[PDB]
Amino acid sequence: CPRFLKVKNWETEVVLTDTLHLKSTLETGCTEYICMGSIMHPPEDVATKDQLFPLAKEFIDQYYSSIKRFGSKAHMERLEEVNKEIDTTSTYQLKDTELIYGAKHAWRNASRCVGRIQWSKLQVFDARDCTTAHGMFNYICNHVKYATNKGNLRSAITIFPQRTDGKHDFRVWNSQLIRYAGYKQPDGSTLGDPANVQFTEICIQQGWKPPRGRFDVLPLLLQANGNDPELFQIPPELVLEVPIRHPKFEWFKDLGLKWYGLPAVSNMLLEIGGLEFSACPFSGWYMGTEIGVRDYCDNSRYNILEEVAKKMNLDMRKTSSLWKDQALVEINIAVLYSFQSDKVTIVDHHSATESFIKHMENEYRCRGGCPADWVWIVPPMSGSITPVFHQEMLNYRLTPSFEYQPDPWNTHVWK
Amino acid sequence: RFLKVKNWETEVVLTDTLHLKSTLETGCTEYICMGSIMHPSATKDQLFPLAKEFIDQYYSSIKRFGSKAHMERLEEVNKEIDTTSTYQLKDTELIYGAKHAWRNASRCVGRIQWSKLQVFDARDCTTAHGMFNYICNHVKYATNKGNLRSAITIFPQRTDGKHDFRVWNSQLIRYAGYKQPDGSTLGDPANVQFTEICIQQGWKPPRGRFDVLPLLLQANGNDPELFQIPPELVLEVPIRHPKFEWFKDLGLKWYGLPAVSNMLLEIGGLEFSACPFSGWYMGTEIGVRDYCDNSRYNILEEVAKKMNLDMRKTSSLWKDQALVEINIAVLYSFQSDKVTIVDHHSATESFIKHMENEYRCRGGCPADWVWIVPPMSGSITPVFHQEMLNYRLTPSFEYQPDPWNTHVWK
Numbered sequence: 100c101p102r103f104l105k106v107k108n109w110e111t112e113v114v115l116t117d118t119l120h121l122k123s124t125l126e127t128g129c130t131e132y133i134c135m136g137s138i139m140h141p142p143e144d145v146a147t148k149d150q151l152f153p154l155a156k157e158f159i160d161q162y163y164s165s166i167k168r169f170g171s172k173a174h175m176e177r178l179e180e181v182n183k184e185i186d187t188t189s190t191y192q193l194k195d196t197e198l199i200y201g202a203k204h205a206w207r208n209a210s211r212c213v214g215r216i217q218w219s220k221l222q223v224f225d226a227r228d229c230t231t232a233h234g235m236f237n238y239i240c241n242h243v244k245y246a247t248n249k250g251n252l253r254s255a256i257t258i259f260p261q262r263t264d265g266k267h268d269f270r271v272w273n274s275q276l277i278r279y280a281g282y283k284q285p286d287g288s289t290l291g292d293p294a295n296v297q298f299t300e301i302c303i304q305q306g307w308k309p310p311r312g313r314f315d316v317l318p319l320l321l322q323a324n325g326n327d328p329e330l331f332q333i334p335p336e337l338v339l340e341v342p343i344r345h346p347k348f349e350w351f352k353d354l355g356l357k358w359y360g361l362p363a364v365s366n367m368l369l370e371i372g373g374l375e376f377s378a379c380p381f382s383g384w385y386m387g388t389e390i391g392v393r394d395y396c397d398n399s400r401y402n403i404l405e406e407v408a409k410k411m412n413l414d415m416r417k418t419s420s421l422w423k424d425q426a427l428v429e430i431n432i433a434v435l436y437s438f439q440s441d442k443v444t445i446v447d448h449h450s451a452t453e454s455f456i457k458h459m460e461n462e463y464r465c466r467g468g469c470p471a472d473w474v475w476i477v478p479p480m481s482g483s484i485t486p487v488f489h490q491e492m493l494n495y496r497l498t499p500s501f502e503y504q505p506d507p508w509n510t511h512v513w514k
Numbered sequence: 515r516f517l518k519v520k521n522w523e524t525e526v527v528l529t530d531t532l533h534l535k536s537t538l539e540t541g542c543t544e545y546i547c548m549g550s551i552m553h554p555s556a557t558k559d560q561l562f563p564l565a566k567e568f569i570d571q572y573y574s575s576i577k578r579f580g581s582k583a584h585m586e587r588l589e590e591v592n593k594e595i596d597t598t599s600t601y602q603l604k605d606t607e608l609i610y611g612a613k614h615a616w617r618n619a620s621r622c623v624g625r626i627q628w629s630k631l632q633v634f635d636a637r638d639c640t641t642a643h644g645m646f647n648y649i650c651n652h653v654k655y656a657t658n659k660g661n662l663r664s665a666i667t668i669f670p671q672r673t674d675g676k677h678d679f680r681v682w683n684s685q686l687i688r689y690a691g692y693k694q695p696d697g698s699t700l701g702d703p704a705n706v707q708f709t710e711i712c713i714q715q716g717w718k719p720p721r722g723r724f725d726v727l728p729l730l731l732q733a734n735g736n737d738p739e740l741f742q743i744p745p746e747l748v749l750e751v752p753i754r755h756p757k758f759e760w761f762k763d764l765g766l767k768w769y770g771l772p773a774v775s776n777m778l779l780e781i782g783g784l785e786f787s788a789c790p791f792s793g794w795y796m797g798t799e800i801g802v803r804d805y806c807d808n809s810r811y812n813i814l815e816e817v818a819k820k821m822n823l824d825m826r827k828t829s830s831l832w833k834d835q836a837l838v839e840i841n842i843a844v845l846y847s848f849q850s851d852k853v854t855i856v857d858h859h860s861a862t863e864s865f866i867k868h869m870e871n872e873y874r875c876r877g878g879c880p881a882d883w884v885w886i887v888p889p890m891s892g893s894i895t896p897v898f899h900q901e902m903l904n905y906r907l908t909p910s911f912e913y914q915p916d917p918w919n920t921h922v923w924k
């Protein structure tokens with residue numbers, strides 16, 4: 100690799116210089132001859148002593164460099180203490196300061212996230228003292244209450260104990276803390292959210308009694324210390340929701356749509372200094388298109404384009420009439436209107452992409468770069484009238500990071 | 515190794531073997547992806563292997579691999595690279611190579627049409643006047659009174675690089691852009707530089723909003739020369755709206771024929787620096803990018819005004835609403851004047867069908883997701899949810915420097 104890589108914005112002509120890519124840590128999947136950039140994903144295999152040493156040192160060095168104490172006595176002592184501990188226990192524990200730094204930087208490093216202008220403002224909840232699923236339930240409830248804040252949403256992460264031997268993992272089996280159930284019908288239709296059919300079925304087998312409605316908040320399915328997972332009902336008063344209405348179309352409310360206020364993804368893995376936090380639910384606030392375009396208008400999701408287009412009395416026989424495009428806009432108008440009216444934090448795709456460009460420029464200037472995944476950063480509607488469409492980006496993997504992990508029901512050893 | 519791509523909407527999985535045949539670079543490395551970079555950065559010796567690979571796949575394509583005709587062609591080519599430091603393609607080869615450069619064009623969503631391409635051999639051309647004649651014939655043919663037909667015209671290949679044939683226009687038909695004294699821009703801002711260069715070369719500009727630019731044509735490395743495309747050859751569409759009667763009062767129009775003229779065609783190591791090619795428009799090319807880019811005609815505000823939308827906050831999505839209406843009008847207007855055009859929904863379905871065809875008969879299809887997904891309503895088109903593998907196959911179309919940056923005037 101060369102020392103300097105340049106990116107260009109084809110709308111503004113601004114050119115930025117990236118040097119941070121030199122700290123790249125893992126493979127992208129791309130090679131010299133193929134690009135895997137549109138590929139979505141390109142047990143007791145735990146880190147050996149030898150594999151762990153340099154990964155720990157790398158992180159510790161980076162941490163002390165960030166607090167302007169690189170090469171200090173405290174730095175050297177921390178290094179030695181981490182080494183001793185890896186040597187005698189085959190693992191090590193992070194200091195609270197290091198945990199907070201690591202969590203914030205995994206967000207900062209998350210190439211697919213358009214919301215990272217916010218990265219340094221993250222409430223970190225240290226849950227490494229947790230031992231049971233009931234305890235996990237307590238921590239998650241507190242997280243949800245704090246992050247929701249009566250609609251004035253605050254970004255937050257709760258971190259449970261790291262992996263040891265791979266047979267004692269903490270996991271949240273939910274993909275997000277709050278999601279709606281989906282039920283496959285005998286006739287092939289789906290009630291509720293089709294995205295969540297598999298996990299809904301799992302909950303039902305585990306003993307969940309389903310209301311069988313369109314917007315049933317799923318139970319938490321929580322695994323502590325590698326034991327079998329356990330079911331819990333989130334208190335309904337902790338689940339903030341927004342009825343979707345349209346500022347012009349009075350009939351829009353009659354669709355009976357609502358969505359939940361807090362996006363809180365719970366199936367990802369947090370890696371810091373070679374340590375693996377398999378349960379680390381984190382939450383921010385929504386970009387409207389996430390609900391209005393994907394959740395509602397994806398064919399294999401709620402798929403309401405048809406019903407909305409009908410109520411708008413559009414010609415639905417020619418694709419070239421753009422009836423889908425027109426309905427898509429009104430739905431996203433309704434979603435933003437309904438959240439803003441109920442004073443629940445939400446950001447539109449124009450504002451968010453504009454902030455991200457400012458953020459990326461600042462990062463290039465003060466950090467020497469900003470990894471970014473164009474395929475994910477550009478919003479799912481109106482792509483080219485947002486500033487990120489014309490922005491060249493470089494994608495690469497920095498650590499600490501958030502990673503994908505297999506679904507736990509595919510790996511769990513039932514006791 | 516074999517690679518899988520998955521559609522997340524339909525769960526269809528395809529297997530790519532075709533990528534194993536590429537040897538050009540993508541720009542990425544194992545540690546940095548450059549997927550969204552627009553332009554990631556011969557001799558006797560270099561030429562023959564390249565010529566060999568091309569002939570090999572041509573004779574393999576007509577199922578005569580290793581035939582007497584095949585063997586003799588290789589030898590004929592080798593002798594010719596020896597005695598002339600280059601070689602000339604057979605007509606069949608020229609046609610095969612042009613079609614395959616299109617088939618291999620990872621950024622083009624229109625490739626289901628790839629084998630329907632009229633190839634015009636212009637390799638006997640020697641002067642800018644001759645270039646003009648060939649290009650007029652191309653435009654007349656491709657336009658076909660609204661029933662557009664894909665075509666490419668191929669001018670003489672690069673020799674020593676001092677005698678290049680170049681079309682200086684980025685497209686055969688484009689509108690002038692003029693840098694206004696008060697600061698703003700009249701016409702198309704994408705073309706301001708080229709427009710100035712035409713004026714500087716003697717073109718008398720009407721200084722309207724839709725002035726068709728003259729052709730600026732360079733033959734054998736000589737100074738370029740100006741030509742006016744006969745107006746009756748330039749098909750245009752007045753843009754109106756099926757419900758908003760005021761839309762026509764905006765005075766907008768566009769041309770029916772998209773004909774990119776500034777790329778390079780490479781076939782078996784040979785380089786064709788002048789190779790204008792044309793198809794027909796996808797509506798968003800005009801209605802999203804050409805009209806609504808900030809640095810293009812930038813008409814969202816005017817439209818949104820006439821629609822009486824709340825433009826005080828972004829979250830009204832007034833830009834999004836105006837965007838859809840403009841693209842409705844563009845499609846409606848071409849369709850009403852019976853000029854070939856495809857909407858982004860129909861175009862992307864066809865591309866998904868094309869991908870399936872190509873994976874079946876060819877073992878893959880190189881595709882650039884960043885360019886294939888339309889600039890509006892992305893995820894409600896089927897390509898958004900389609901994993902793609904991008905890789906570079908030859909014959910191909912490549913970018914080249916703008917000629918005014920290199921040309922030593924005379």
Ligand code: HEM
Binds near residue numbers: 215254256384
């Ligand atoms: C605070 C406001 C935030 C906004 C507006 C925001 C916005 C987004 C959006 C729109 C996406 C794409 C999601 C999708 O299409 O499904 C995304 C992805 C992502 N975000 Fe953020 N986000 C925010 C907060 C956070 C926080 C607090 C974290 C972690 C601490 C985070 C980490 C991530 C990660 C790892 C992804 C990629 C998910 C994946 O690949 O599956 N974001 N974000």
Ligand code: HEM
Binds near residue numbers: 623791796911
């Ligand atoms: C027949 C109808 C066709 C349609 C509907 C179509 C559609 C498109 C569209 C929408 C783009 C994106 C252009 C942009 O965003 O600037 C594109 C790019 C491209 N097309 Fe096609 N196309 C067609 C025919 C052709 C033909 C005949 C050729 C060559 C023989 C071709 C070669 C290319 C190439 C090389 C690019 C990428 C150029 C670049 O990298 O800037 N296309 N096409």
Ligand SMILES: Cc1cc(N)nc2cc(-c3ccc(CCN)cc3)ccc12
Binds near residue numbers: 386389
């Ligand atoms: C922290 C945060 C905030 C936000 N507004 N959206 C997120 C969206 C995700 C996300 C949601 C769903 C998926 C599944 C594929 N779309 C992948 C990632 C994760 C975290 C988010």
Ligand SMILES: Cc1cc(N)nc2cc(-c3ccc(CCN)cc3)ccc12
Binds near residue numbers: 772774793794799
């Ligand atoms: C052959 C063909 C057909 C079509 N409908 N659009 C094209 C559009 C292009 C094209 C147009 C503009 C640009 C510059 C960046 N938008 C790059 C490529 C090239 C060829 C096209």
Ligand SMILES: C[C@H](O)[C@H](O)[C@H]1CNc2nc(N)[nH]c(=O)c2N1
Binds near residue numbers: 136137138139475476
């Ligand atoms: C195939 C493609 O990679 C996949 O559909 C991606 C594309 N970009 C995306 N971008 C975001 N923000 N979210 C997504 O789910 C996706 N899906």
Ligand SMILES: C[C@H](O)[C@H](O)[C@H]1CNc2nc(N)[nH]c(=O)c2N1
Binds near residue numbers: 109488489491551886
């Ligand atoms: C930065 C980015 O690569 C650039 O804006 C690209 C993005 N995708 C595109 N896709 C198409 N079809 N046409 C374009 O001009 C572009 N521009």
Ligand SMILES: [Zn+2]
Binds near residue numbers: 135548549
């Ligand atoms: Zn890549």
